[PDB]
Amino acid sequence: RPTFYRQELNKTIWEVPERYQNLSPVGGSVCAAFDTKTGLRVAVKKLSRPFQSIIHAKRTYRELRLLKHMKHENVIGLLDVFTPARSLEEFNDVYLVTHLMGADLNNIVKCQKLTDDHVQFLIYQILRGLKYIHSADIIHRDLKPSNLAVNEDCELKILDFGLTRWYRAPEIMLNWMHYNQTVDIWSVGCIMAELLTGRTLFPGTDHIDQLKLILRLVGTPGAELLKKISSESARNYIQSLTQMPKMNFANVFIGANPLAVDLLEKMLVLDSDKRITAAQALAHAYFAQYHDPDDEPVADPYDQSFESRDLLIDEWKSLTYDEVISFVPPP
Ligand SMILES: O=C(NCc1ccccn1)c1ccc(Oc2ccccc2)cc1
Ligand SMILES: CCCCCCCCO[C@H]1O[C@@H](CO)[C@@H](O)[C@H](O)[C@@H]1O
Catalytic residue among 35, 116, 117, 160: 160
Question: Candidates 2.70.150.10, 2.60.120.10, 3.90.870.10, 1.10.510.10; correct CATH number of 103-298?
Answer: 1.10.510.10
**Cα–Cα distances in Å, from 86 out to 3, 158, 305?**
12, 32, 29
Q: d(Cα 150, Cα 104) in Å, to the nearest integer?
A: 6
Q: In sequence order, which residues have a C-beta less than 8 Å from that of residue 96 and are 6 or more positions away?
A: 44, 45, 47, 63, 64, 67, 78, 80, 81
**Cα–Cα distances in Å, from 50 out to 33, 62, 117, 260, 306?**
22, 11, 42, 43, 17
76 touches ligand 1 (CB under 6 Å): yes
79 touches ligand 1 (CB under 6 Å): no
Q: d(Cα 230, Cα 25) in Å, to the nearest integer?
A: 48
CA of 95 to the centre of ligand 1 (A): 13
Q: d(Cα 253, Cα 240) in Å, to the nearest integer?
A: 29
40 touches ligand 1 (CB under 6 Å): no
Residue 147's nearest CA partner among 206, 196, 107, 193 is: 107
Partnered with residue 5 across adjacent β-strands are 16
Return the ligand number nearest the Cα of 101. Answer: 1
**Resolution given for this structure, in angstroms:** 2.0
222 annotated binding-site participant: no
Question: What is the widest separation between alpha-carbon atoms in the chain?
Answer: 65
Residue extents of the structural domains in the chain: 14-102, 103-298
Do residues 265 and 284 lie in contact, with contact meaning Cβ atoms separated by under 8 Å?
Answer: no
Treating both helix axes as pointing N-terminal to C-terminal, what angle do 183-197 and 116-135 enclose, rounded to 10 degrees?
170
Q: d(Cα 135, Cα 127) in Å, to the nearest integer?
A: 12
Q: d(Cα 32, Cα 100) in Å, to the nearest integer?
A: 7
> Is residue 160 annotated as a catalytic residue, yes or no?
yes
Q: Given its phi and psi angles, is residue 11 left (phi above 0), alpha (psi -120 to 50 degrees) or beta?
A: left
Q: d(Cα 44, Cα 25) in Å, to the nearest integer?
A: 9
Do residues 112 and 122 lie in contact, with contact meaning Cβ atoms separated by under 8 Å?
Answer: no
Q: d(Cα 217, Cα 214) in Å, to the nearest integer?
A: 6
Do residues 299 and 133 lie in contact, with contact meaning Cβ atoms separated by under 8 Å?
Answer: yes
Question: Candidates 3.30.200.20, 3.40.50.740, 1.20.140.10, 3.20.20.70; correct CATH number of 14-102?
Answer: 3.30.200.20
CA of 71 to the centre of ligand 2 (A): 31
